[PDB]
UniProtKB/Swiss-Prot annotation:
Interval of the full protein contained in this chain: 588 to 665 of 2441
Intracellular or extracellular location(s): Cytoplasm; Nucleus
Source organism of the structure: Mus musculus
Name of the protein in its database record: Histone lysine acetyltransferase CREBBP
Record PTM Asymmetric dimethylarginine, positions in chain: 13, 37
Record's function text: Acetylates histones, giving a specific tag for transcriptional activation. Mediates acetylation of histone H3 at 'Lys-18' and 'Lys-27' (H3K18ac and H3K27ac, respectively). Also acetylates non-histone proteins, like DDX21, FBL, IRF2, MAFG, NCOA3, POLR1E/PAF53 and FOXO1. Binds specifically to phosphorylated CREB and enhances its transcriptional activity toward cAMP-responsive genes. Acts as a coactivator of ALX1. Acts as a circadian transcriptional coactivator which enhances the activity of the circadian transcriptional activators: NPAS2-BMAL1 and CLOCK-BMAL1 heterodimers.
Residues bearing PTM N6-acetyllysine: 69
Residue span, KIX domain: 1-78
Post-translational modification: Methylation of the KIX domain by CARM1 blocks association with CREB. This results in the blockade of CREB signaling, and in activation of apoptotic response. Sumoylation negatively regulates transcriptional activity via the recruitment of DAAX.
Subunit structure, as described in the record: Part of a complex composed of MSX3, CREBBP/CBP AND EP300/p300; the interaction with MSX3 decreases histone acetylation activity. Interacts with DHX9 (via N-terminus); this interaction mediates association with RNA polymerase II holoenzyme and stimulates CREB-dependent transcriptional activation. Interacts (via transactivation domain and C-terminus) with PCNA; the interaction occurs on chromatin in UV-irradiated damaged cells. Found in a complex containing NCOA2; NCOA3; IKKA; IKKB and IKBKG. Probably part of a complex with HIF1A and EP300. The TAZ-type 1 domain interacts with HIF1A.
Length: 78
């Protein structure tokens, strides 16, 4: 349990999970991507966010390094 974890809400953690999904699929039309397909992307994004949440030593490092991963993915996918 790290000190900075006490100041990060689950709503921020979910928000960054969904930013990772958006980096791969910026137009999440459910006619293009079905229910199980969406759940798979969210499952992978949760592992990526989860690893940063456990390893970061500050709220700034957590947010800015996840933002850097999101932009890296967005570049690779665009
Ligand atoms: S999208 C074209 C690029 C590619 O083959 N990549 C970059 C993105 C991935 O690292 C990836 C794919 C799906 C998800 Cl849900 C994630 C992540 F959000 F990080 F979990 C990453 C796959 C390899």
């Amino acid at each position: 349990r790290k000190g900075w974890h006490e100041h990060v809400t689950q709503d921020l953690r979910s928000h960054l999970v969904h930013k990772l999904v958006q980096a791969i699929f910026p137009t999440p039309d459910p006619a293009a991507l079905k229910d199980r397909r969406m759940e798979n992307l969210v499952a992978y994004a949760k592992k990526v966010e989860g690893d940063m949440y456990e390893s970061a030593n500050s709220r700034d490092e957590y947010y800015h390094l996840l933002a850097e991963k999101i932009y890296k993915i967005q570049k690779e996918c665009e």
